[PDB]
């Protein structure tokens, strides 16, 4: 039984201050400092240059302590300001600098002074950004493809990688000084007449520079806590500032001793990771595991910390996570509705103890789950690892928080992840220690490279349209892979030849997508080393190189395949109504597609495509297994490739499939013409691996049956299942045991990847669209993450409103 | 019987024009163009950027045809102008820009316009040069060492590498178009989802850009030959311009057909190598071998070319080689007296034909040797490969040209090079095909990396002084390796402990010298790829990477060890007069050294050190073998290291020893305090492996006996033996057979590396110092190369005058 409605006035005030910043500012301090240090340290090796950049910026940037917070450390000069990261790109910044205030769902306030700084700073970076260096190396074919949008790698060319959890256990065990000794021991083995050691030494030096800077930065906050306390009238707050300054002094160097110390050190690293890099889905991993030793002592064993005060510490941290901000281009913002950072916290699961699995749920799991239920913030992205031996008590507490209406927790599934991770070659103890990263993707926190998911996007719908029409992409007018068969030519002899054309086209776009990733990953590898992040991932220090160079113990990545339901639904309709029945002719379908189903005749055809052929999500094998078979081609193609770190250190070095495409369904649909499932041109595609909205008519159990027929084991980037309920459907205990049995059957029987529940009423979302000043704290689940509804663009809002409402 | 006194009026006029340019100009066209293209192509990979730089510069630079030359292609805008190469360094340029006209022996004329260009161009390069990037990576210890001058790598930090011969046979066999097809075939095997191929493709693309640019550049000269012919009044010259334009059009694409075509293509590559890079000792290799097929057809078989006209073609080429110029810093110019480019031409030797050696001397060998005797220019640096089966006829022709007084030919020795190259693992056919490079060093032309010699300089004398005195370097006052024993402390128990201190100190400076080379080589590797040069060396195209990245079939390098005679002479004196005799005390010697032998007492001590202990070069085993034993420590130390290309492609990847230090003996001596061989502080050290001047009193046969006792097989960078004769000593046929027998005994019996003869009178060099406008064509041999005496600084002049005059 959880108390999920109580918040301290400290937390309420802080939380309310954050939710009411609706046009957050842009901070340019980091952009200035990195430009200054790049210019003065042009002679240094890039990782050393980048280390000196971070050191300079930390020592000279604006720091502060606000809202009487118990966890300190600001990302930028102003509250919720987005720093600027010019080394990735300045292209969209120079184009959009005057027009940032009014981008729908992605508006930022650029002060006139900050506008002037950016106009001095940005021209220097031209030619030197990751994105420019990508275009300096792309072939013309690769450039053409990217220009269409059929393949996209915008999130990789304009941002740091992130999409991982660092080794928080190592950090807590050694402290910063013990990492320094680790680095020193490793440099003691450098032989400067060995080429690899010459390079390793430069990277190890950079790590040491950064560790020193982090130690000094924590001390800088300790000194700030003291100076503020000397002018703090309220006694109680002043004792807090003192204890924090005391705590900072310790964690600046030594392994933390108290739970409050351990959390602050973890947050410090979490924050500085997102100062040295704007990569998102920086994730905490299994915090209920590696923070439990401190919780057990402070809260249970020595009872020197009140469990209510511990929850108050967590709340302070969560609000700091909401403070983290990130600005994106106009285009990429549409694919990330709600300005998300995707900072994941994993709880639950199991532990491999002496070769025997054991439930990992503990009181900290409960206290974390409860702290999130009380706070109902979009950060952290709370993920529960389900397993068969997870208790009804804990699973009930989870549903109690699902009831609170902010979309959390979501569920990953040990019953699929651990067996498949072990199959890949991950050491079983490590596989049992996996975390959620960002949204639904999974990795072994602290031992894995970047991007378990987040590599290039392929628009499956547009590739399919091209396969039905001579390789012609109607959006761009290009034919990247010519083929003779086309509906407009009526020269398809049977549906098998349509599948051939799908197979042939998707084999082409997959190869080109890997070629493009090779360019981007390599430009990132050479230009934007993450020093702190590498330092905190096995085994970068020992190997003396960055994560992107092969430093991580494990390296597997996935891209995102967009338009899943649309691919299956479209093939199933042309298979049935064109080929199995002759009810619709090839030239007739093609004319309706080129026309966007215009006119009452084509509109009747369209409605026949919509309702006279089966749709993914109704437990109909004829469409579900056709979708799996279409996807299987892409999955098989992936097997012939290796990722760029292959053979350079990590286990694996391979690709697998992924469907966590966030809100890319909306802009990807915008550039997708009409499709044979009856979808109108420019309208959203389906999101994730969810059924197309309004096509799933046989209830949620039919949905999870369809989803289970995908090749989940090959889609280790994650199969995203959204689901929407009206609050009344979850009001009763028998409604609760209903949902619980549905979860366990999904995970234990269907081996499903993931589920998340939206509990919201169609009236609430309509009213909030009308009066946003009222629901500034209303949180809605989008695709893998939750967001503030009033902070979404109307386009993104209506996509949520258009989603199926299901009944248990 | 050679006609060595005849020159055409064409050649005389051209030669006289060149010798009378005494303050050559600086050209800034290349510096502008490389700056422009680096700036516009910041987004391209460095080899692609550098390829586009060369393409831009070739297409836009000033070209011309002058002096009615038969071989065309200018290096810079003005005759004998030195281009400027900012990517290596702009440090000495910014310091010395206003003071270049009056550097003794290294004066250049910088027009006011060119001064303005350099002042705009150079600041951009700060932080981005090879030299700046070296100092961005050196440890403090490495920086301190370099600041003393005890180790020097100035020629590597401020210049391209060169020091090789490209694969002229491959060039002649395929032509430019066939190289293009080779590149295309190789790119056809690039897989852009394989990391190594991604990088290989960038390098292959750069090569193709450059090949295209060279083809277009040859066509640009063809068009210039035509435009000039249309305004050429003299019929005969106009037919020449036409034939050349015709020849250029062919060699711009196809394998050359005529000897005149083959020579011009070879020169075109020789010239453009020294436009893309200012590295010197760019060498032609065995031109008498790979040009013979064309000579045999045009001159002997079809008699369509007069052998006198062929010699006239060679002469035109040689004068183009003299046109090539290069400016150096004030400091490094003192180590390279006479503005030398060291463009070597190897003739003679043998050929491994079906496993059987065969004399390689042919009519082209004779015609080349004769053309150099007639011209008496400092370029090319003509080198004969002696072998036991070399004829008396050819060896007589060689001595006939030695008689002409310009220092050439010098001799390398197959009897030592081939056995030792094969011992290294060089394929026997390749070992038999070796060439001279630059001065005395040797390599397999077309298949070898850069720097057979030319890596870091170590001052052996200063290391020895530090070994006699606590590790203290008296010039700098530093103690890089402290030791307890010091003459000033009189705490040496015996001479064996002095050798221990030598061994210990030189082991330290050798390691540091390799550490420094690792930094410099790596900064060169990453920043200044040579595209054309790599393209023309096995196996860079196949491996798809630069020479500096491991592209070459063979890779061995050597540094330069300076003060050879001084090391042996100094140890032998302290061994005998301090330790074996007690005639001189430890504190007494140290006080005289710290005093620079000042006062009549210390001057008497000094004369006892000079003449009362044996000197290297008198065939005295007690000093000669002590020198060999001292050097042997350095040679053994080298065995524990690998050069940076080791394991990255080439056979070998190792170091050996080298003594071709050019004129570094003079500035190295300037920074060497007094030494126990009686040498005064700041005075020259001995050059190469030559006896200290005036210490060799028992004639030339005693000199070659001393030299032969060095470990020649371990000094594959070359053992430099200068020797000076008065012209009268070579006047008679019995004086000739004398010298010939001395050569064969040196090479066949003593296995000597090299010999070169100066035939000049002490009166001539004195008169020329007084009246230089008279002897502008007087050539003197310095150390491995010949130079114009009137173009030397007084310091360098007197070092030549101070050399021993020997009698046969």
């Amino acid at each position: 039984t959880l108390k999920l409605d109580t918040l301290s006035d400290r937390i309420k005030a802080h939380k309310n201050a954050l939710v009411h910043i609706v046009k957050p500012p842009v901070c340019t301090e980091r952009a200035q400092h990195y430009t200054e240090m790049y210019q003065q340290h042009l002679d240094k090796p890039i990782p050393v240059r980048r280390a000196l950049a971070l050191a300079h910026h930390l020592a000279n940037r604006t720091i502060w302590i606000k809202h009487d917070e118990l966890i300190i450390g600001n990302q930028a000069s102003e509250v919720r300001a987005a720093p600027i990261f010019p080394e990735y790109t300045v292209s969209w910044i120079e184009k959009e600098i005057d027009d940032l205030a009014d981008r729908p769902g992605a508006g930022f306030a650029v002060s006139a002074a900050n506008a002037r700084v950016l106009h001095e700073v940005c021209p220097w970076w031209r030619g030197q950004t990751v994105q420019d260096r990508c275009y300096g190396m792309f072939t013309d074919e690769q450039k053409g493809l990217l220009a269409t949008g059929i393949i996209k790698a915008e999130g990789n060319m304009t941002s740091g990688d992130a999409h991982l959890a660092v080794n928080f256990p190592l950090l807590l065990e050694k402290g910063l000084d013990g990492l320094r000794e680790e680095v020193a021991e490793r440099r003691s083995r450098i032989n400067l007449t060995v080429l690899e050691d010459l390079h390793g030494e430069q990277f190890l030096k950079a790590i040491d520079i950064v560790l020193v800077a982090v130690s000094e930065h924590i001390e800088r906050f300790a000194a700030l806590a003291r100076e503020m306390a000397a002018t703090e009238t309220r006694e109680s707050r002043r004792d807090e500032l003192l204890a924090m300054a005391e705590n900072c002094d310790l964690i600046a160097h030594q392994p933390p001793q108290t739970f409050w110390q351990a959390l602050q050190l973890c947050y410090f690293i979490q924050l500085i990771l997102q100062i040295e890099s704007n990569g998102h889905s920086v994730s905490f991993g299994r915090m209920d595991q590696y923070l439990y030793p401190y919780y057990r002592r402070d809260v249970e064993l020595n009872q020197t910390l009140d469990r209510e005060h511990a929850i108050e510490m967590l709340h302070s941290c969560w609000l700091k996570l909401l403070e983290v901000n990130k600005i994106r281009s106009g285009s990429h913002s549409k694919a990330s509705a709600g300005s998300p950072l995707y900072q994941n916290v994993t709880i639950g699961g199991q532990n491999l103890v002496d070769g025997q699995p054991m439930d990992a749920v503990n009181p900290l799991s409960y206290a974390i789950l409860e702290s999130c239920g009380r706070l109902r913030s979009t950060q952290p992205n709370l993920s529960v690892r389900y397993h068969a031996g997870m208790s009804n008590d804990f699973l009930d507490a989870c549903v109690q928080v699902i009831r609170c209406g902010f979309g959390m927790p979501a569920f990953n599934n040990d019953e699929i992840v651990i067996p498949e991770f072990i199959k890949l070659g991950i050491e079983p103890q490590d596989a049992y220690d996996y975390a959620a990263i960002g949204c639904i993707e999974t990795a072994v926190g602290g031992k894995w490279g970047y991007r378990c998911t987040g590599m290039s996007f392929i628009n499956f719908a547009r590739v399919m349209l091209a396969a039905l029409e001579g390789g012609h992409d109607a959006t761009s007018g290009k034919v990247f892979l010519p083929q003779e068969k086309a509906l407009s030519a009526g020269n398809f002899n049977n549906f098998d030849e349509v599948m051939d054309a799908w197979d042939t086209q998707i084999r082409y776009y997959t190869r080109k997508s890997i070629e493009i990733e090779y360019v981007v990953d390599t430009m990132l590898e050479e230009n934007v080393h993450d020093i702190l992040c590498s330092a905190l991932v096995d085994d970068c220090i020992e190997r003396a190189k960055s994560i992107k160079q092969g430093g991580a113990k494990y390296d597997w990545v996935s891209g995102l395949q967009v338009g899943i339901a649309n691919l299956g639904n479209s093939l199933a309709a042309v298979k049935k109504l064109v080929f199995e029945q002759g009810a619709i002719g090839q030239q007739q379908l093609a004319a309706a597609l080129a026309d966007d189903f215009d006119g009452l005749t084509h509109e009747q055809l369209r409605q026949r495509l919509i309702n006279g052929a089966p749709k993914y999500g109704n437990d109909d094998d004829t469409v579900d297994t056709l979708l799996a078979r279409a996807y299987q081609t892409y999955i098989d193609e992936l097997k012939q490739y290796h990722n760029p770190r292959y053979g350079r250190g990590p286990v694996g070095g391979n690709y697998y499939a992924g469907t966590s495409s966030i809100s890319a369904n909306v802009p990807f649909g915008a550039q997708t013409m009409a499709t044979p499932d009856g979808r109108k041109a420019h309208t959203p595609l389906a999101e994730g691996a969810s059924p197309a909205s309004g096509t799933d008519h046989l209830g949620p159990t039919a949905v999870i049956g369809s989803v289970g027929k995908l090749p989940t084991a090959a889609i280790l980037g994650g199969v995203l299942l959204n689901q929407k309920l009206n609050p009344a459907t979850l009001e009763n205990e028998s409604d609760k045991q209903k949902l619980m049995i549905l979860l366990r059957t999904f995970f234990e029987v269907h081996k499903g990847w993931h589920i998340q529940y939206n509990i919201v009423s169609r009236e609430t979302l309509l009213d909030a669209k009308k009066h946003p000043d009222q629901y500034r704290d209303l949180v809605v689940r989008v695709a893998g993450y939750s967001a503030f509804f009033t902070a979404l663009s109307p386009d993104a809002q209506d996509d949520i409103i258009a989603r199926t409402e299901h009944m248990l």
Side-chain angles (χ1 to χ4, degrees), chain A:
Chain A
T1 198
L2 297 169
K3 299 307 188 354
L4 297 160
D5 64 346
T6 167
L7 280 191
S8 80
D9 299 332
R10 206 214 300 274
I11 301 307
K12 302 194 191 151
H14 190 180
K15 173 181 182 180
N16 196 261
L18 305 181
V19 301
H20 273 106
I21 300 155
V22 317
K23 193 149 312 189
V26 162
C27 179
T28 71
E29 291 190 350
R30 189 206 179 272
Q32 293 168 251
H33 289 167
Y34 272 59
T35 306
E36 280 158 23
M37 294 295 99
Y38 264 60
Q39 270 162 353
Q40 151 178 359
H41 290 296
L42 248 201
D43 66 328
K44 312 291 193 303
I46 283 150
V48 170
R49 191 184 312 154
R50 292 186 58 73
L52 293 169
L54 181 59
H56 191 244
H57 175 63
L58 296 179
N60 285 263
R61 74 195 185 88
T62 306
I63 62 166
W64 42 252
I65 298 172
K66 287 180 185 262
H67 308 109
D68 303 323
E69 70 214 335
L70 308 174
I71 301 287
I72 61 175
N74 57 302
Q75 189 200 18
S77 55
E78 312 188 55
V79 178
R80 284 210 64 181
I84 292 278
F85 299 72
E87 64 261 58
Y88 305 106
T89 186
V90 298
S91 305
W92 69 263
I93 302 178
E94 291 194 319
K95 295 166 176 208
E96 296 184 45
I97 192 41
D98 302 343
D99 314 327
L100 294 177
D102 290 306
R103 305 175 318 170
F108 286 81
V110 189
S111 83
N114 283 329
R116 274 184 305 269
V117 175
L118 291 173
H119 282 89
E120 337 181 300
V121 144
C122 284
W124 189 82
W125 286 94
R126 293 179 195 145
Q128 293 186 86
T129 61
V130 175
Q131 179 163 43
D132 280 350
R133 296 232 152 113
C134 288
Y135 280 82
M137 185 180 273
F138 285 135
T139 72
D140 297 316
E141 188 186 39
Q142 288 153 6
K143 281 165 183 190
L145 288 163
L146 289 161
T148 71
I150 305 178
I151 300 154
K152 285 192 207 194
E154 151 94 348
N156 321 74
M157 291 190 267
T158 69
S159 164
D161 264 320
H163 286 85
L164 54 71
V166 296
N167 203 328
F168 294 103
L170 174 66
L171 173 78
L172 298 168
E173 187 196 285
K174 322 270 223 153
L176 289 153
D177 277 9
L179 292 177
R180 289 258 267 141
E181 315 165 18
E182 231 189 281
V183 166
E185 194 277 336
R186 181 53 183 84
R187 292 174 79 180
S188 94
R189 290 182 273 124
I190 286 299
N191 178 348
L192 288 175
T193 66
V194 171
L195 183 56
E196 261 163 37
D197 285 5
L198 180 53
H199 290 293
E201 164 58 17
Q202 304 315 312
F203 197 71
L204 290 168
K205 184 201 297 193
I207 286 176
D208 193 59
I209 292 179
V210 160
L211 289 172
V212 164
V214 173
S215 280
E216 289 175 2
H217 199 57
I218 297 185
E219 279 155 10
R220 205 188 158 193
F221 275 98
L224 178 68
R226 284 170 179 121
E227 205 66 316
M228 302 191 341
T231 67
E232 175 50 23
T233 82
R234 311 169 272 141
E235 200 205 313
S236 70
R237 179 48 180 167
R238 172 162 63 43
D239 311 84
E240 289 172 339
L241 297 183
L242 269 38
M244 300 202 292
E246 177 148 338
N247 277 345
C248 281
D249 283 322
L250 193 141
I251 59 174
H253 290 278
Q254 307 159 54
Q257 278 152 15
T258 73
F259 175 94
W260 195 15
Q261 272 152 25
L263 182 61
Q264 176 65 78
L265 187 47
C266 284
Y267 169 71
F268 264 138
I269 269 53
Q270 176 82 5
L271 163 77
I272 297 184
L273 292 170
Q274 303 174 89
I275 285 164
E276 79 172 347
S277 170
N278 67 344
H280 61 244
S281 314
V282 180
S283 304
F284 262 130
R286 314 183 59 188
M287 181 183 274
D288 70 333
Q289 303 304 289
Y290 60 72
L291 280 204
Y292 187 54
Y294 312 82
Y295 183 90
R296 181 177 65 83
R297 286 190 295 265
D298 296 18
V299 171
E300 311 170 49
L301 281 200
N302 304 350
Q303 324 209 156
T304 73
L305 177 77
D306 196 324
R307 177 178 187 277
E308 288 305 295
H309 201 215
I311 287 180
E312 175 110 323
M313 279 157 193
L314 297 178
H315 281 158
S316 295
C317 185
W318 306 154
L319 290 191
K320 293 314 267 176
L321 302 185
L322 184 52
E323 289 187 18
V324 179
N325 210 350
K326 173 170 166 153
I327 186 177
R328 302 167 170 106
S329 60
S331 208
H332 197 50
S333 290
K334 297 155 169 182
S336 7
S339 295
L341 266 299
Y342 320 103
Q343 302 174 83
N344 191 287
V345 166
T346 290
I347 61 181
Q350 318 158 68
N351 280 311
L352 201 61
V353 179
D354 282 292
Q356 225 52 50
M358 299 180 351
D359 188 15
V361 181
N362 60 49
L364 184 52
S365 329
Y366 278 97
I368 284 157
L369 174 66
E370 197 179 343
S371 66
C372 295
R374 293 188 193 175
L375 185 60
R376 301 170 200 211
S377 173
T378 66
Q379 298 290 280
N381 211 24
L382 176 60
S383 281
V384 174
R385 278 173 55 180
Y386 176 78
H387 61 111
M390 162 164 305
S391 79
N392 267 18
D393 194 281
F394 184 69
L395 190 56
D396 194 282
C398 291
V399 183
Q400 279 179 65
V401 176
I402 306 201
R403 272 240 292 172
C404 301
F406 66 106
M408 280 173 230
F411 289 97
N412 289 90
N413 178 22
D414 293 9
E415 305 316 326
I416 184 62
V417 176
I418 301 169
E420 290 308 313
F421 267 15
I422 286 159
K423 244 177 255 199
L424 285 185
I426 289 145
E427 288 164 23
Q429 186 154 244
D430 288 336
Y432 268 84
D433 201 38
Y434 86 88
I437 302 295
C439 292
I440 70 173
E441 58 269 41
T442 57
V444 177
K447 317 180 160 208
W448 199 289
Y450 307 115
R451 308 269 189 185
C452 32
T453 214
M455 296 309 302
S456 70
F457 286 61
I458 300 171
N459 188 322
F460 269 11
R462 287 174 74 179
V463 174
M464 181 228 77
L465 281 177
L468 296 166
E469 193 49 47
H472 185 262
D473 170 58
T475 305
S476 70
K478 309 278 172 152
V479 193
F480 281 103
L481 185 60
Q483 73 180 37
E484 67 159 359
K485 315 258 183 173
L487 287 183
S488 70
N491 55 354
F492 272 109
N493 290 311
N494 50 83
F495 188 66
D496 280 351
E497 303 190 334
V498 167
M499 283 322 272
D500 288 346
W502 163 252
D503 288 352
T504 307
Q505 294 286 335
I506 197 56
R507 283 188 199 121
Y508 163 88
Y509 287 98
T510 304
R511 182 170 294 107
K512 300 296 132 169
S513 78
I514 305 300
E515 291 178 7
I516 282 157
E517 296 188 12
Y518 257 77
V519 172
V520 175
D521 275 356
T522 297
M523 290 310 94
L524 291 158
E525 175 183 358
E526 294 186 353
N527 288 293
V528 286
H529 312 69
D530 297 316
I531 310 306
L532 178 58
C533 190
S534 290
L536 303 184
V537 168
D538 305 9
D539 313 313
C540 289
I541 295 170
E542 184 47 36
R543 282 165 209 193
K545 56 165 149 188
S546 88
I547 296 177
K548 208 68 180 190
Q549 299 176 276
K553 181 181 188 186
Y554 303 113
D555 198 307
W556 286 272
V557 301
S558 58
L560 288 315
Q561 295 82 59
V562 184
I564 304 300
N566 303 89
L567 173 60
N569 296 344
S570 286
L571 300 168
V574 345
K575 160 163 166 147
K576 165 172 186 148
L577 303 160
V578 171
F579 286 88
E580 286 181 343
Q581 305 208 288
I584 296 177
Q586 295 187 25
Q587 291 95 339
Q588 186 191 358
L589 184 54
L593 295 182
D595 269 285
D596 195 16
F597 299 119
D598 205 60
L600 295 174
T601 281
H602 279 160
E603 174 57 20
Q604 293 177 335
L605 203 160
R606 181 179 96 92
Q607 299 289 333
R608 276 162 71 208
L609 295 167
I610 296 180
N611 291 298
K615 296 297 178 275
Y616 168 68
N618 295 287
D619 208 2
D620 194 328
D621 284 351
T622 58
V623 58
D624 300 347
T625 68
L626 178 61
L627 169 51
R629 141 84 179 83
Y631 208 162
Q632 189 54 46
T633 306
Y634 170 81
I635 286 156
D636 286 350
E637 265 306 284
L638 282 187
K639 290 169 172 140
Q640 96 185 255
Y641 303 106
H642 298 304
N643 83 41
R645 275 82 51 199
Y646 176 90
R648 301 208 282 146
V651 168
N654 277 325
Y655 297 100
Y656 45 62
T659 74
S660 208
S661 43
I662 314 296
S663 46
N665 67 297
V666 175
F668 274 47
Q671 332 163 281
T672 309
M673 288 319 102
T675 46
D677 54 349
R679 191 196 131 270
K680 287 287 271 187
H682 312 297
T683 62
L685 305 165
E687 106 278 3
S690 290
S693 278
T695 65
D696 47 319
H697 297 126
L698 307 178
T701 290
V703 174
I704 59 113
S706 279
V707 179
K709 290 160 207 166
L710 295 174
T712 322
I715 313 169
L716 297 187
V719 164
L720 197 150
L721 184 51
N722 266 315
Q723 193 141 101
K724 184 161 92 194
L725 311 188
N726 185 277
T729 203
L730 214 29
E731 232 149 56
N732 155 35
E733 169 145 79
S734 212
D735 295 329
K736 169 151 64 193
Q737 293 164 331
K738 252 150 145 162
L739 193 49
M740 278 159 112
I741 297 306
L742 183 58
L743 299 194
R744 300 208 192 247
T745 169
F746 190 39
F747 292 147
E748 306 198 14
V749 177
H750 298 259
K751 303 302 196 226
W753 189 262
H754 158 271
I755 198 133
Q756 64 201 2
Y757 270 113
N758 230 314
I759 309 306
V760 77
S761 86
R762 192 202 181 87
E763 297 93 67
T764 291
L765 294 198
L766 289 179
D767 197 59
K769 279 194 57 167
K770 321 172 209 284
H771 326 101
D773 289 345
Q774 309 219 36
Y775 304 82
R776 299 248 147 244
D777 56 340
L778 166 66
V779 173
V780 292
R781 195 103 184 153
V782 189
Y785 66 105
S786 286
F788 287 104
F789 185 79
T790 56
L792 298 173
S793 78
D795 278 21
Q797 270 173 342
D798 295 338
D799 202 64
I800 313 305
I801 303 174
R803 290 184 185 169
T804 309
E805 206 185 292
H806 264 303
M807 257 288 331
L808 296 162

